[PDB]
């Protein structure tokens, strides 16, 4: 098992990590540095200013969250010292990428588990959040934020880069997931950890309401095709149909007293957009397009019923996430035996042509994309009211 580093000696190692290189490059301030090994240092320096000014603050009871953020930045260099290579050049031969592992204590029989690189960057993402206004990217960035020293550009990089990361470090734990789960499921312990907006929910009215369109679009979808069932459908449509019913139908078991209405509409909302990005890749689409698809009835259909040609970045990522949570509870099967899998039967078993492993990559995908919509959104923004 890899044992983290405490926060102290992080501090203390990169301390020592700029005079080093500063030592070696000859130079005063790491603003004089080439680059990108400027703005990385400028990066880290700004971390950890705003990570310490949080400590001496709030005063926290553990510093664990503080040094999964710590880790998250670190490895986000590293990464972009990976990208900023030559073609020839190596990442072990760089000295700071060497002294950031090395801080970290990672080598090469010491590296952390898939669940660790989750939570750092998970951290990160969060931490990212103290630029905007209220931490809400809904009000764009501060006019102050701990990451001034560096431009707007490199500001979205470093974040698109690091909703990246996240991204491909979910999608490297569920392709090591196996289907051996023999734990049942238990929707009577799913409980959301914070209640959600109800202004994000209200544009469906209610949770009948919703339920009733969704059942409305599938009959028209079956009369516009004339056929009986959904069967006869495609196998790809068929499936994401199923999907969206089984959705619904099992959202219904659930007493409203144990879970409420507007947390449901949430998951559904986000099952909509889910399938709603499957048919936007089949015509080769982004799977968060506004463009209409004149030629699909069900991708048409939910943009109606989600409003999401109206709807923002942030409020989509909301209820992406929402029905994410869910699945991954009613189909994954978490420790505290050992590491996770797939239950071998679930809510998707039965339905014939699902791929359980595309829909949870889908979601990570999409939440990535509305994250980085956001940043660029914000960037934009604050490059026009800076240029006027």
Not at 57 to 67: D, F, Q
Not at 144 to 152: A, G
Not at 210 to 233: F, P, R, T, W, Y
Not at 247 to 257: H, S
Request: aromatic share 6%; net charge negative.
């Amino acid at each position: 098992t890899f044992v983290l580093k405490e926060f102290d000696a992080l501090k203390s190692h990169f301390n020592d990590t700029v005079k080093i290189i500063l030592q070696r490059e000859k130079k005063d301030k790491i603003e004089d540095l080439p680059n990108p090994r400027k703005e990385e240092l400028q990066f880290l320096t700004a971390v950890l200013n705003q990570l310490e000014a949080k400590i001496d603050e709030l005063k926290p009871r553990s510093l664990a969250s503080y040094v999964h953020v710590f880790y998250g930045a670190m490895l986000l260099v590293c990464k972009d010292v990976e990208n900023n290579l030559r073609v020839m050049e190596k990442k072990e031969n760089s000295l700071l990428f060497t002294r950031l592992m090395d801080g970290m204590g990672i080598s090469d029989e010491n590296i952390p588990t898939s669940e660790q690189n989750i939570m750092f960057y998970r951290g990160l993402n969060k931490f990212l959040n103290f630029i905007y206004e209220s931490n809400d990217s809904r009000k764009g960035l501060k006019k102050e934020h701990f990451l001034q020293v560096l431009s707007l550009k490199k500001i979205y990089s470093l974040a698109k880069l690091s909703y990246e990361q996240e991204e491909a470090a979910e999608n490297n734990a569920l392709a090591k997931l196996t289907a051996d789960g023999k734990t049942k499921a238990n929707a009577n312990s799913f409980h959301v950890e914070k209640p959600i907006d109800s202004s994000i929910v209200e544009q469906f009215k209610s949770w009948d309401e919703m339920k009733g369109a969704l059942h409305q679009l599938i009959l028209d979808e079956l009369s516009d095709k004339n056929v009986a069932k959904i069967s006869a459908l495609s196998q790809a449509r068929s499936a994401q149909l199923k999907f969206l019913q089984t959705m619904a139908e099992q959202l219904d078991k659930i007493p409203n007293q144990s879970l409420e209405p507007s947390e449901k509409m949430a998951i559904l909302a986000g099952a909509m957009y889910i399938v709603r990005g499957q048919i936007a890749q089949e015509y080769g689409k982004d799977p968060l397009s506004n463009d209409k698809i004149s030629a699909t009835v069900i991708h048409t259909g939910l943009s109606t019923i989600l409003h999401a040609n109206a709807d923002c970045c942030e409020d989509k990522e909301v209820l992406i996430a929402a029905a994410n949570k869910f699945i991954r509870h009613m189909v994954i099967e978490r420790p505290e035996i050992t590491k996770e899998s797939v239950r071998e039967n679930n809510m998707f078993s039965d339905i014939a042509g699902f791929q359980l492993i595309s829909v949870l990559t889908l979601i990570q995908n999409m939440i990535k994309t509305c994250r980085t919509d956001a940043i660029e959104a914000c960037v934009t923004k604050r490059k026009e009211e800076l240029e006027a």
